[PDB]
Curated annotation (Swiss-Prot), chain D:
Keywords: Acetylation, Cytoplasm, Glycoprotein, Nucleus, Phosphoprotein, Proteasome. PANTHER family: PROTEASOME SUBUNIT ALPHA/BETA. Belongs to the peptidase T1A family. Induction: Up-regulated in colon cancer cell lines. Up-regulated in fetal Down syndrome (DS) brain (at protein level). May be the target of the transcriptional activator NFE2L2. Its main location: cytoplasm. Expressed in fetal brain (at protein level). The modification Phosphoserine is found at S9, S49, S56. It comes from Homo sapiens. It is found in: Cytoplasm; Nucleus. Component of the 20S core proteasome complex involved in the proteolytic degradation of most intracellular proteins. This complex plays numerous essential roles within the cell by associating with different regulatory particles. Associated with two 19S regulatory particles, forms the 26S proteasome and thus participates in the ATP-dependent degradation of ubiquitinated proteins. InterPro entries: Ntn_hydrolases_N, Proteasome_alpha, Proteasome_alpha-type, Proteasome_alpha_type_5, Proteasome_asu_N, Proteasome_sua/b. GO terms for cellular component: cytoplasm; cytosol; extracellular exosome; extracellular region; ficolin-1-rich granule lumen; nucleoplasm; nucleus; proteasome complex. The gene is PSMA5. This is Proteasome subunit alpha type-5. It comes from the Eukaryota.
From Swiss-Prot, chain E:
It comes from Homo sapiens. This is Proteasome subunit alpha type-3. Belongs to the peptidase T1A family. The gene is PSMA3. Pfam families: Proteasome, Proteasome_A_N. The 26S proteasome consists of a 20S proteasome core and two 19S regulatory subunits. The 20S proteasome core is a barrel-shaped complex made of 28 subunits that are arranged in four stacked rings. The two outer rings are each formed by seven alpha subunits, and the two inner rings are formed by seven beta subunits. The proteolytic activity is exerted by three beta-subunits PSMB5, PSMB6 and PSMB7. Interacts with AURKB. Interacts with CDKN1A. Interacts with MDM2 and RB1. Interacts with the C-terminus of TBXA2R isoform 2. Interacts with DNAJB2. GO terms for molecular function: ubiquitin protein ligase binding. GO terms for biological process: proteasome-mediated ubiquitin-dependent protein catabolic process.
UniProtKB/Swiss-Prot annotation, chain G:
The 26S proteasome consists of a 20S proteasome core and two 19S regulatory subunits. The 20S proteasome core is a barrel-shaped complex made of 28 subunits that are arranged in four stacked rings. The two outer rings are each formed by seven alpha subunits, and the two inner rings are formed by seven beta subunits. The proteolytic activity is exerted by three beta-subunits PSMB5, PSMB6 and PSMB7. Directly interacts with POMP. Interacts with ABCB1 and TAP1. GO terms for molecular function: endopeptidase activity; peptidase activity; threonine-type endopeptidase activity. The active site is at T1 (nucleophile). The chain holds residues 60 to 260 of 263 of the full protein. It is found in: Cytoplasm; Nucleus. This is Proteasome subunit beta type-5. It comes from the Eukaryota.
UniProtKB/Swiss-Prot annotation, chain H:
Non-catalytic component of the 20S core proteasome complex involved in the proteolytic degradation of most intracellular proteins. This complex plays numerous essential roles within the cell by associating with different regulatory particles. Associated with two 19S regulatory particles, forms the 26S proteasome and thus participates in the ATP-dependent degradation of ubiquitinated proteins. It comes from Homo sapiens (Human). GO terms for biological process: proteasome-mediated ubiquitin-dependent protein catabolic process; proteolysis involved in protein catabolic process. The lineage of its organism: Eukaryota, Metazoa, Chordata, Craniata, Vertebrata. It is found in: Cytoplasm; Nucleus. Changing Y75H: In NEDMHAL; uncertain significance; results in impaired proteasome assembly. Belongs to the peptidase T1B family. The gene is PSMB1. The keyword Iron does not apply. GO terms for cellular component: cytoplasm; cytosol; extracellular exosome; extracellular region; ficolin-1-rich granule lumen; nucleoplasm; nucleus; proteasome complex. This is Proteasome subunit beta type-1.
Length: 215, 250, 239, 228, 240, 238, 201, 213, 204
């Protein structure tokens, strides 16, 4: 892919006590045009891991097709094994690096949140094969805007509960609605626990416009 | 898969070949040809195996295959096995001319064919060629030349030759009546009429059953001559006159 | 594409096809060759000309380079592929390393070519056995031989063809260094040895020498009459 | 009389590789002995004619500077294996700057000992002895056309391979020295060959940790015969 | 004889014995039966314990091709795992190209052409396997198919593969099949296995049961086997 | 007998005899015994010697940090499947960054050995692989065959006179779950000693033991550290 | 980077500097630029360091196999011919290699010059590098075929010193080898800062 | 267009001791003007006696690490032993040259003990050349660290300064001082300083904090 | 341009019962001549020639590839080649190198092998045939050659005035050209004989 046609935007993610919460919005844009107002940008991998992505959306449907097949392939064996969230993060890194080595990359930026064996996992995947782990991740302009809000609380208090982490994402998604030119007031929140993967509905923020009277 | 193979590649338990000897005995039947040079010019003798009176004979050319502006050949064996070889050897002589812009010498053209005929005997189990043939030609290095070919890929230089099994007795005549450089081109022609008189068991040597093609050197043209049917007949009547003349001593 | 093996093992532990093609070498004409200290010599026998035909095309002694000379047995067509292959390799060796080709190098090329030509699938072996004579740099004359198995092998005198062991038995009682002293005596040595071959009436003997500083020079059919004359004169002193 | 090249026996073994072991029996004999001081090695040339040049027939062929070889069987089939074993040691040094060990040489050799077939030929007909000195001291190994690779203390193969191995078990122990093992080997050689022992019938090859190469010019050979 | 070597030569009366030989090679294996109710398909495979020979749960002949498609193989064992790898591979390409679940009618046809392809050439042999195909869909119903080593593939309401084939299908038709729910059929299939195969041949045998249908939401899985245990209790009421 | 030549040709009885001949090639190799506890998996092998001066041919070989295999039969088919075995372990280590579970690796072997048992001009692999290792759910003992029928067993033995080796196992298979390593190993080598003539057993030159455990990488012992295991044995009765 | 090589009555003298840079930054001062191939051959380094280090190491692979097959050491003109053919296959792809080949041969001394541009010339004196032109002038003023061993050492030693003094990229230490008939031998390895005090007075 | 390269940062230091080897690196992984993480060490324990450092483009660093880890296992199953320090450096040079016309963008330093228990440091380049040195510093802050160790460890440009061998404890405070001065002037030098010490008894790790700006 | 690298000019003209063809003699590289004997007209059988102009590589290359296919055609058949058959043969040979084209423009002149009927045609560098009834021209100095033949050609002309018309057409057009000159050779063929003359041109 040389030119991304229909693109996504920033995706957030942060660990908490016994789970990882990931939120992203529901807009696909073609340049300055907000063309597709209602799409899903979060894929629920089987039971303990979870994927969101930015960048080109047509490439995201391709990886949604491939990863969806591989999970079915192990379940049909039925030997009592599964892919860990780290193994998918390891697999997806080699997929990106081999793709860019042929000078024909996949224009994406992917965030993997997982929770297995009582361990919250949060992994980053770049288009250029750059991958790491972090207690809080942000893509796009969220790495410029929401990422200072994430690291400020986590360096003050390292651990978080579920309600503290869920409220803190809604504050960062509010800020991205103000300062990002290509955002939208309709987002969905996905959360892994030990009970499984649950995806919330099309939530929205509440803005403040009291400074408009100040000339 | 494995029991259907014919194994035309293994040697004989005697320690020789086994399939080529079967092929070389087909050449002796179905055809009889020869050629003779001793001076400027060279002839080729042919024989009509099928002489039925409902053929067209509209090719106006025959077993003499003019493969070059300086060379031709006379073939005997399986008939359309030659048409693979004549079209192939015609193009070897022509790709040489593309490479050098100079006509092909008669020696190394024969070596090009004999490497092809050997290659089916070396490897594969492909059926080998049941084809032996002759060569006539002029070059810048030795002039007029004759060459015999074999199905085995063997060749050699000759001055009087043989193909057919009936012409094995002609070799006994060619040892008896050959000269050393006295080929006036009537003595060479009356000898060839004398050979095919005794060898070919068809009586009186009808002019339609045989064929003669000659190659003479012009100033720079190398005229290849396929002589017509009228002058065959006066050459036969010349040879019949010499037989009636020579029997006067008895 | 022909995926079928020709040469396999026998229950007694031998190969069929290698010891099955050496009889074709035994049905060829004989050609012997010795070496001196300065002039090598090799002579084919059994010319068997048709006495009215050409002879410059039935040559059984050729050269790969200006150093190396050939002589073989077996069938005619298989030698032509091996010779025209080895002319390419000895000339491509000079395109590499700029020396002339040593005579031991070209025998390893032929024997390795003939070995994989039996190891592979769907391929008849060759049926020839060559003599390779050369006097390389430093001027040391030596000769080798081949085999349809592909074993290069250095001798001081060789005999092949139909009647090889009889001529080798003649040289077996002929180990004299005095015959390798004079050059014309060494040529008369081969002419006496080729006289033990079939009829050898001075006409079927085609010999060729090389004085290690010159290309191969075939003796004319007058020195063959001259050397057979002095061999008859040397045989007359038996009384 | 024409069965498969790739077919098991009804008893269950094989067809053709069993015949390959029989092909070793018609070759000349060879003796190699591993000592704690080094590896000595011996072979018989089997001279046919005095017209034949003797040094053109070799059995000891160097593989690397510290690894020798010994062959018995079909000659030019062994020449394929020698040329590969030389190359694959050079691939080892020009990718690792170290010498390939004596065991790990034969691992690469015995991979295509049994790879004959149609896609992707016949099995080979030579048995080999590999001596050499490496970081585990001097070593000695033995292989076969069936790819069965093993380490031996003192293996003897060839036509007289049976009577050699029986006599060798009498005279061998673990605390041998070098020159004691050298003259003990040729005593076995003159019992198993038919010609008189001289400077032309046999040849030796002795590799040491100190004397790092195998170095057996002639007339050292006559020095040992006059001392026995 | 003389005509039965390759699979590319016809007999002088008009058939191929290499296919005929491989059919009764399937006959020497143990009994695997299959049946469908009005809202599901029930599988049942007798498995023989020789002396110990395995940890129980080894090499079960009830494979799992797709989420809604199951196997019940018999005959030779190693080639059955090869056909399972073909059928899993075929259902993935239908998913990738066409974007929905594979119908069982096509999945039978694509496999049976692949089985047919090894009956035409001398380079390969025919398969020595035979199996079943069960599925369920709310837009289609419950379907049950059957493939011989020759490649004939069509439907059944019930079938049996193994040594006990004709003796095992005599009591299958004695049942009612239309009005039954498959949970009733689970304890029915237990007794057909338990009636046949007296312990004179083999003393130890063991029963597997696979089960796809409307209760399983279309997904294929094994029965709760150690759970509820009404297979063996209701089967051993055949004492008289 | 004429239909007993190629792998492709079926029998008129329906038994391809080329596979049945390859089962005989496994019975010519030396015996070996593998078994497992709840928490450990130990396989014990027996070596042979070609001569007195020759070293003993090794049997157990390391593959991965938890998978190690035993061998029986040919040696070309040994190393040819071994190079395929080491290759597949480091691939999923390179791709997924995790060790392979033992069960689905063996399914790759049955797919690997399937093709030369069906096409023309290809022998089956005469081989006797006993496989031990950990997946995430404990020890496993697997065995293979040239017919490619892999078996999830708990204790088996393959090779020459393993008939007597199996008989010792079922009369002590109940003990093979609660006991720890010191008697788990010497339960196993009590089974090898009936695969022998009655005058030699285990004299520190012909036995090797490989153990894989929970906190234990797959470790091979040979003839010097085997000597702590070879003490505390009763002799054979008569 | 400055190397030179010249042959005379008593063999071949090879000298080089030891500085490898990176733009305006000096990577190291102790780079051994004269690559030792055999006990009887020597190679140099010019331009691309990894290009000269790889292919001369690959050239040593072929020379060792040639000795095992032919029971003879390779000749000097042979090794230069093999190196020219390997580099020609990558012509136009941007290889930097201007090395020299030195060694004793059966025909006497041997000195050749191989470029990455397919150049293969023989000769008597050569000088390769960015500061090579500063070495031609001082050497040709002092060169003779009939020199002594101690004389030829001091000529090549100062010639490297005059190059590094003028050039910016050349510097470090002066390595000095001597190719003799039996084989090469290391002479010395001198620092430029020590030579500066020697040639000051 | 799609440019396949980007710079990430990091700084690697190695010192060949008399019987030890010290490898140090920071933990900042940056890109452009932003910080991805503050915990990303560049130390990698290859064997018990060899630690490698990898800087430059991070996507090639993850790839090149996993290639070497496979070939260590391929060596051991083929040769029944482990690689030495110099054998890994000889192997790595062919791997880096194997992509000559599409190179890695990775600066490599291998430190560790030899087969005699002495410190060996091998520096590298993104195309494949290497040499053995006493100390090298690679990465973004490589120019701010080379001339200082020339004064301290190399004892250059000092009159009447003796040549004492560097002890272990003196080498520890030399490493801890240079990364403080590097963090003041470089923007890529991060927070945690992972220090690996390879002795003849094992590998010890140690983490020292720096300024967090 | 690439066509103007060596230059040249080929002209053919149809007469009453005869046909004439002519070309120049100069071989040069862009300013610098080399020789005056570069052949550009090649015989293809009797009473049928061909002329080539453009890049001198493709002049010598195509004339040998066409001769390669021609001798194979006249040996598979017994007859000679017809002029329409040759035009289809050349148009095949140029179109095969559709994207790596030969830089030449052929001109074919000849008679009927049965009657006295003449034939002229010219082709593009990729192989579009074009038959006329009066004249065809090719080369760098094309526009000067159109100005001659549009003002001098007459329909029914004896072989004498046909020679005088094509001579004045070449000598006035090529002397106006810079990179072409150094002599003009003229072939005038008819049913019974072939006449070849060389004209007296400006050698500057």
């Amino acid at each position: 892919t040389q030119n991304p046609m229909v693109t996504g935007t920033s995706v957030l993610g942060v660990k908490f006590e016994g789970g990882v919460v990931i939120a992203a919005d529901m807009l696909g844009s073609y340049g300055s045009l907000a063309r597709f107002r209602n799409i899903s940008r979060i894929m629920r991998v089987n039971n303990s891991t979870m994927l969101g992505a930015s960048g080109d959306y047509a490439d995201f449907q391709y990886l949604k097709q491939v990863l969806g097949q591989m999970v079915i392939d192990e379940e049909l064996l039925g030997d009592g094994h599964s892919y860990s969230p780290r193994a998918i993060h390891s697999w997806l890194t080699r997929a990106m690096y081999s793709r860019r080595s042929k000078m024909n990359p996949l224009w994406n930026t992917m965030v993997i949140g997982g929770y297995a064996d009582g361990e919250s996992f949060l992994g980053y995947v770049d288009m250029l094969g750059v991958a790491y782990e972090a207690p809080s991740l942000a893509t796009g302009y969220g790495a410029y805007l929401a990422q200072p809000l994430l690291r400020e609380v986590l360096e003050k208090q390292p651990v978080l509960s579920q309600t503290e982490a869920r409220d803190l994402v809604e504050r960062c998604m509010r800020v991205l609605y103000y300062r990002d030119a290509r955002s939208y007031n309709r987002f969905q929140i996905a959360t892994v626990t030990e009970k499984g993967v649950e995806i919330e509905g099309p939530l929205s923020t509440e803005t403040n416009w009291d400074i408009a009277h100040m000339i | 898969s494995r029991r259907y193979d014919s194994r035309t590649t293994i040697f004989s338990p005697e320690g020789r070949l086994y399939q080529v000897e079967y092929a070389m005995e087909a050449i002796g039947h179905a055809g009889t040809c020869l050629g003779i040079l001793a001076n400027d010019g060279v002839l080729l003798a042919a024989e009509r195996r099928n002489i039925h009176k409902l053929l067209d004979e509209v090719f106006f050319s025959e077993k003499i295959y003019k493969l070059n502006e300086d060379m031709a050949c006379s073939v005997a064996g399986i008939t359309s096995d030659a048409n693979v070889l004549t079209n192939e050897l015609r193009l070897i002589a022509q790709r040489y001319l593309l490479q050098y812009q100079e006509p092909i010498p008669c020696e190394q053209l024969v070596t090009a064919l004999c490497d092809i005929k050997q290659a089916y005997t070396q490897f594969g189990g492909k059926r080998p060629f049941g084809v032996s043939l002759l060569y006539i030609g002029w070059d810048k290095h030795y002039g007029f030349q004759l060459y015999q070919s074999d199905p085995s890929g063997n060749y050699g230089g000759w001055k009087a030759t043989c193909i057919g099994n009936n012409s094995a007795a002609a070799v006994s005549m060619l040892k008896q009546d050959y000269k050393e450089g006295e080929m006036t081109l009537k003595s060479a022609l009356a000898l060839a009429i004398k050979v095919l008189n005794k060898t070919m068991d068809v009586s009186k040597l009808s002019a339609e059953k045989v064929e003669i093609a000659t190659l003479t050197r012009e100033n720079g043209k190398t005229v290849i001559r396929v002589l017509k049917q009228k002058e065959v007949e006066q050459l036969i009547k010349k040879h019949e006159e010499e037989e009636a003349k020579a029997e006067r001593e008895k | 594409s022909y995926d079928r093996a020709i040469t396999v093992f026998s229950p007694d532990g031998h190969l069929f096809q290698v010891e099955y093609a050496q009889e074709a070498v035994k049905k060829g004409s004989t050609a012997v060759g010795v070496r001196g200290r300065d002039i090598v010599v090799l002579g084919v026998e059994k010319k068997s000309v048709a006495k009215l035909q050409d002879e410059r095309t039935v040559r059984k002694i050729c050269a790969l380079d200006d150093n190396v000379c050939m002589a073989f047995a077996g069938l005619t067509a298989d030698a032509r592929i091996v010779i025209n292959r080895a002319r390419v390799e000895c000339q491509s060796h000079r395109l590499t390393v700029e020396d002339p080709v040593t005579v031991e190098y070209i025998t390893r090329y032929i024997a390795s070519l003939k070995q994989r030509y039996t190891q592979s699938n769907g391929r008849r072996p060759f049926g020839i056995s060559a003599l390779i004579v050369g006097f390389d740099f430093d001027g040391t004359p030596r000769l080798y031989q081949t085999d349809p198995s592909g074993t290069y092998h250095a001798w001081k005198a060789n005999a092949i063809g139909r009647g090889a062991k009889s001529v080798r038995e003649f040289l077996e009682k002929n180990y004299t260094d005095e015959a390798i002293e004079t050059d014309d005596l060494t040529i008369k040595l081969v002419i006496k040895a080729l006289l033990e071959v079939v009829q050898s009436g001075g006409k079927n003997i085609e010999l060729a020498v090389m004085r290690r500083d010159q290309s191969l020079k075939i003796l004319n059919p007058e020195e063959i009459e001259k050397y057979v004359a002095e061999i008859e004169k040397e045989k007359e002193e038996n009384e | 009389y024409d069965r498969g090249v790739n077919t098991f026996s009804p008893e269950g073994r094989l067809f053709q590789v069993e015949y390959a072991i029989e092909a070793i029996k018609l070759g000349s004999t060879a003796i190699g002995i591993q000592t704690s001081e080094g590896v000595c090695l011996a072979v018989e040339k089997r001279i046919t004619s005095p017209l034949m040049e003797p040094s053109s027939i070799e059995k000891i062929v160097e593989i690397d500077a510290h690894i020798g070889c010994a062959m018995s069987g079909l000659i030019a089939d062994a020449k394929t294996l020698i040329d590969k074993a030389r190359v694959e040691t050079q691939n080892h040094w020009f990718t690792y700057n170290e010498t390939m060990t004596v065991e790990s040489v034969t691992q690469a050799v015995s991979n295509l000992a049994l790879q004959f077939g149609e896609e992707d030929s016949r099995p080979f007909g030579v048995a080999l002895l590999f001596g050499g000195v490496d970081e585990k001291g001097p070593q000695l190994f033995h292989m076969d056309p069936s790819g069965t690779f093993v380490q031996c203390d003192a293996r003897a193969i060839g036509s007289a391979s049976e009577g050699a191995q029986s006599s060798l078990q009498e005279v061998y122990h673990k605390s041998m020295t070098l020159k004691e093992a050298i003259k003990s080997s040729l005593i076995i050689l003159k019992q198993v060959m038919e010609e008189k022992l001289n400077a032309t019938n046999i040849e030796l090859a002795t590799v040491q940790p100190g004397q790092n190469f195998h170095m057996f010019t002639k007339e050292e050979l006559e020095e040992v015969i006059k001392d026995i | 004889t003389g005509y039965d070597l390759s699979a590319s030569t016809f007999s002088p009366d008009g058939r191929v014995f290499q296919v005929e030989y491989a059919m009764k090679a399937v006959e020497n294996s143990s009994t695997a039966i299959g049946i469908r109710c009005k809202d599901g398909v029930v599988f049942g495979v007798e498995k023989l314990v020789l002396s110990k020979l395995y940890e129980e749960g080894s090499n079960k002949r009830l494979f799992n091709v797709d989420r809604h498609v199951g196997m019940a193989v018999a005959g030779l064992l190693a080639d059955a795992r090869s056909l399972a790898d073909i059928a899993r591979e075929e259902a993935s390409n239908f998913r990738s190209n066409f974007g929905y679940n594979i119908p069982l009618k096509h999945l039978a046809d694509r496999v049976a052409m692949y089985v047919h392809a090894y009956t035409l050439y001398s380079a390969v042999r025919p398969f020595g396997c035979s199996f079943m195909l069960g599925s369920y869909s709310v837009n289609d119903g419950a379907q049950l198919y059957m493939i011989d080593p020759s490649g004939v593939s069509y439907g059944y309401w019930g079938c049996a593969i193994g040594k006990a084939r004709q003796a095992a299908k005599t009591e299958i038709e004695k049942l009612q099949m239309k009005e039954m729910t498959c949970r009733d059929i689970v304890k029915e299939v237990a007794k057909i296995i338990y009636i046949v195969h007296d312990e004179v041949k083999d003393k130890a045998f063991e029963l597997e049961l696979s089960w796809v249908g409307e209760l399983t939401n279309g997904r294929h899985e094994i029965v709760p086997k150690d759970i509820r245990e009404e297979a063996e209790k209701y089967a051993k009421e055949s004492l008289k | 007998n004429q239909y007993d030549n190629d792998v492709t040709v079926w029998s008129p009885q329906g038994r391809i005899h080329q596979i049945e001949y390859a089962m005989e090639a496994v019975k010519q190799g030396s015996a070996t015994v593998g078994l497992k506890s709840k928490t450990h998996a130990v396989l014990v092998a027996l070596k042979r010697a070609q001569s007195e001066l020759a070293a003993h041919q090794k049997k157990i070989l390391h593959v991965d940090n938890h998978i190690g295999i035993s061998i029986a039969g040919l040696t070309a088919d040994a190393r040819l499947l071994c190079n395929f075995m080491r290759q597949e372990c480091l691939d999923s280590r390179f791709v997924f960054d995790r060790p392979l579970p033992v069960s689905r690796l063996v399914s790759l072997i049955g797919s690997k050995t399937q093709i030369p048992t069906q096409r023309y001009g290809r022998r089956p692999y005469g081989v006797g692989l006993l496989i031990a290792g950990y997946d995430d759910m404990g020890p496993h003992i697997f065995q293979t065959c040239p017919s490619a029928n892999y078996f999830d067993c708990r204790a088996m033995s393959i090779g020459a006179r393993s008939q007597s080796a199996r008989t010792y196992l079922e009369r002590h298979m109940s003990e093979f779950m609660e006991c720890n390593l010191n008697e788990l190993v010497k339960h196993g080598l009590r089974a090898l000693r009936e695969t022998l003539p009655a005058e030699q057993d285990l004299t520190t030159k012909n036995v090797s033991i490989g153990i894989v455990g929970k906190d234990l990488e797959f470790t091979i012992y040979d003839d010097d550290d085997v000597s702590p295991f070879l003490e505390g044995l009763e002799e054979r009765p008569q | 980077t400055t190397t030179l090589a010249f042959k005379f009555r008593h063999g071949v003298i090879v000298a080089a500097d030891s500085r490898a840079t990176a733009g305006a930054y000096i990577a190291s001062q102790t780079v051994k630029k004269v690559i030792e191939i055999n006990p009887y051959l020597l190679g140099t380094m010019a331009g691309g360091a990894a290009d000269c280090s790889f292919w001369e190491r690959l050239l040593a692979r072929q020379c060792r196999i040639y000795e095992l097959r032919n029971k003879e050491r390779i000749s000097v003109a042979a090794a230069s011919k093999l190196l020219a053919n390997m580099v020609y296959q990558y012509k136009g792809m941007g290889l930097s290699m201007g090395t020299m080949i030195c060694g004793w041969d059966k025909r006497g001394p041997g000195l050749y010059y191989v470029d990455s541009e397919g150049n293969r010339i023989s000769g008597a004196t050569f000088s390769v590098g960015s500061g090579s032109v500063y070495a031609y002038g001082v050497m040709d003023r002092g060169y003779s075929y009939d020199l002594e061993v101690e004389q030829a050492y001091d000529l090549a030693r100062r010639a490297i010193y005059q190059a590094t003094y003028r050039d910016a990229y050349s510097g470090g230490a002066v390595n000095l080898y001597h190719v003799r008939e039996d084989g090469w031998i290391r002479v010395s390895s001198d620092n430029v800062a020590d030579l500066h005090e020697k040639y000051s007075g | 267009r799609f440019s396949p390269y980007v710079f990430n940062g990091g700084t690697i230091l190695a010192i060949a001791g008399e019987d030890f080897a010290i490898v140090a690196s920071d933990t900042r992984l940056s890109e452009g003007f932003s910080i991805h993480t503050r915990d990303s060490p560049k130390c990698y324990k290859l064997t018990d006696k060899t630690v490698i450092g990898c800087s430059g483009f991070h996507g090639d660093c993850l790839t090149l690490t996993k290639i070497i880890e496979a070939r260590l296992k391929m060596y051991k199953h083929s040769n029944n032993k482990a690689m030495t320090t110099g054998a890994i450096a000889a192997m790595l040079s062919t791997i880096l040259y194997s992509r000559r016309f599409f190179p890695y963008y990775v600066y490599n330093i291998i430190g560790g003990l030899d087969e005699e228990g002495k410190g060996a440091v091998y520096s590298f380049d993104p195309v494949g050349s290497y040499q053995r040195d006493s100390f090298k510093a690679g990465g973004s802050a490589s120019a701010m660290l080379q001339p200082l160790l020339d004064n301290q460890v190399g004892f250059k440009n000092m009159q009447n300064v003796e040549h004492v061998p560097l002890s272990l404890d003196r080498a520890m405070r030399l490493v801890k001082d240079v990364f403080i001065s590097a963090a003041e002037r470089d923007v890529y030098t991060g927070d945690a300083l992972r220090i690996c010490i390879v002795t003849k008894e094992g590998i010890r790790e140690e983490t020292v904090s720096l300024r967090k700006d | 341009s690439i066509m103007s690298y060596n230059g040249g000019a080929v002209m053919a003209m149809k007469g009453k019962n005869c046909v004439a063809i002519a070309a120049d003699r100069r071989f040069g590289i862009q300013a610098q001549m080399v020789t005056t004997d570069f052949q550009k007209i090649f015989p293809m059988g009797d009473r049928l020639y061909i002329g080539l102009a453009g890049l001198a590589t493709d002049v010598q290359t195509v004339a040998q590839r066409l001769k390669f296919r021609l001798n194979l055609y006249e040996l598979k058949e017994g007859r000679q080649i017809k002029p329409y058959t040759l035009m289809s043969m050349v148009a095949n040979l140029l179109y095969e190198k559709r994207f790596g084209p030969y830089y030449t423009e052929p001109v074919i002149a000849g008679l009927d092998p049965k009657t006295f009927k003449p034939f002229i045609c010219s082709l593009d560098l990729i192989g579009c045939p074009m038959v006329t009834d009066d004249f065809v021209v090719s080369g760098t100095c094309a526009e000067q050659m159109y100005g001659m033949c549009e003002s001098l050609w007459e329909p029914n002309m004896d072989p004498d005035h046909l020679f005088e018309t094509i001579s004045q057409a070449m000598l006035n057009a090529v002397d106006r050209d810079a990179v072409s000159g150094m002599g003009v050779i003229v072939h005038i063929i008819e049913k019974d004989k072939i006449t070849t003359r060389t004209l007296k041109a400006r050698m500057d």
